[model samples]
Target: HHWGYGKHNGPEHWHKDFPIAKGERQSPVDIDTHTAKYDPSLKPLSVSYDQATSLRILNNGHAFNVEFDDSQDKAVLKGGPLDGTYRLIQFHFHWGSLDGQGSEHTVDKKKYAAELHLVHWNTKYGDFGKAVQQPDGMAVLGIFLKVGSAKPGLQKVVDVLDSIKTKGKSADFTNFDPRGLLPESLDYWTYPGSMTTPPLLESVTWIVLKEPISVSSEQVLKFRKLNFNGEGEPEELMVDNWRPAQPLKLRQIKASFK
Candidate 1:
């Protein structure tokens, strides 16, 4: 029972909302320092807690996504200034154009208002799409959602976002606890990237979290309210989904506790 943006309906007239299978591109951006070709053997190999498993929640009516089951918590990365470890495969996010403009990290170029990716991988150099094609396999943990106060780690994920709030409805949110949605300042901004959507996979290791998490514009307008798009299509409500902020082909991005 949610969906806004009329006239040909929202999400910019959804054509699978920018998804030519998995390429042709279109999704929150900013990471281009000559397209960065650095290769630190791509690291990510320390994920304890019995390797942590069973954490799944998907109610993409706009957001409430969580997925992790790294099979056997495996990982490895070894070398100077850093050593072996990698095996934590799975994490997700990429939103905007609707909630103000889903984020992909951009400052001097400006682009934010909503963003929350948490993808991860490194199965010791196997699986996870051939380790996203090296350069450190992949690892992303970004967060940014500015609007106004009320983000106590996003009210424990919208108090379960009213149990999916309607759409394909989902459940199994187990006593989840991602340190309450993190942000007491793990102070980050690291880099070496890829995966801004599209097979744009170059294997990542990005982590942009300076401090941003306050949602309340009524939980950012319930992700523009939702209906998804399918089912009795009248263009199915909830329009202008957003996904327009790509192009930075110069890449370098470094902020480490900066």
Candidate 2:
């Protein structure tokens, strides 16, 4: 959900949706000053996904998202084999109520326009809880959603947002492929981390893409219009869905090229 928000409501209230939510380390909201032991090299890697590669690409409109069911044997996490093959479940974004002020990760307290979380989990675990409990259980390819410039391959998804503007609606996404949303470069910043939401188990190996995908200003506004709660009286949808930052604790944020 994506509109009007209040305390104890919206995505921030995911704890209600998942009982183990609070015990986990939620992301975008977790902030720390810890420096990367490795230097962050922002080089782009060549990556592409054609129609033959993805299972299907859907466009609900309000948000430009993708779904990848087939796993790439070449796509290794931290240059190591994935514990279990991960079929892409769903991809979505988190935004703020205002421009230049949304997103969970802050640069010295400053926020980006938004953040995209490409959620994928081990197929073996079968359930979210079981998967999130293991060190190599889950992987969320984090992409910072910025406004402007060329809209990466994602224009394929953005071009269809108008079809679902009414809310709580979804449409058939035909011959579409999921890879269209990937940035050309697979070069990224990675770390041993946990889920960005509640039940923040130290299980995820976070891969924050170094390069960001660009979208038009109008597209961002459309994304902001989505709300989680169903239509009704003063529905507390998610507008400013971001939670406050969390402590860095004993964790060291690791970068790939570092």
Candidate 3:
């Protein structure tokens, strides 16, 4: 009944609750690589993260997010479309019910099996809550996931899912560096977009990576086992939690690689 990735409450119905769901600059846009402009001016990405800042993992009903302490700049993201240093607060992922369809964004209309979102807030706005309202408030790094060989560091994350299988559940996930989740290339496409969830705030600067990381078929299936309902309620598989690509509409997509 609430907002979900169901037939009745999915992306198609999000606009009813979040007015900006139909906004011009909504996220998860299709990046036509053949047509994407290569901008030589794009700066190289600077990612410096400390493993000690990782705090806990939480099943927030919608998705499982790995939270980090942002009070200090223990984990940070800079360059490559960022105007200033941004603090990493948390990260989450979106996947589908089946192996062929899950990723939110597509390149040249081709979708990956899943996608990871690393959420960071600009310190210029003080805190995440206030930053979510400003135009330059947030920066989300998107990484696509393909089904194949299992990723090197992913098992560390997958190993803990058993403890937080239900909504509102959390467990310690300290001393882990989320930077290990990124792909080899720093090349990416950048644009202005909104959050892919309720509130759908138009405060994000989307930085989507070009290369995809590998995940085993078994690993992808594990993601589907997560439940939307907590204990005592009817269980619902947490799959296909991605919002389809919205209209680009007058926006320009800039690329860091040729």
Q: Against the unseen true structure, what C-alpha lDDT does each candidate score? A: 0.53, 0.56, 0.90
TM-score of each: 0.31, 0.71, 0.98
Off by over 4 Å in 3: none
Q: What is the lDDT of residue 77 in candidate 2?
A: 26
lDDT of 3 at 133: 98
lDDT pick, better of 2 and 3:
3
Q: How many clashes (backbone N, Cα, C below 3 Å) per candidate? A: 36, 19, 0
Best by lDDT: 3
Residue range with the least summed lDDT across 10 consecutive positions in model 2: 73-82
Q: State the local distance difference test value for candidate 1.
A: 0.53
Candidate with top TM-score is: 3
Among all windows of 10 consecutive residues in model 1, the one with the lowest summed lDDT is 74-83
Tens digit of per-residue lDDT, candidate 2, span 121-186: 665777656777787788777776677875656565566555544445455555565465566667
Model 1 alpha-carbon drift over 4 Å, by segment? 1-30, 35-55, 58-62, 74-83, 97-100, 107-116, 121-138, 141-163, 166-170, 173-223, 226-258
Candidate 3: tens digits of C-alpha lDDT, residues 1-258: 578888898889999988899888898799988778999999998887853398999998889999999997878899998999889999999998887888989999999999999999999999999999999999999999999999877887888988889899999998887767889998999999989888899999999999999999888888889998897889998888999989999799999998
Which is better, 1 or 2, measured by TM-score?
Answer: 2
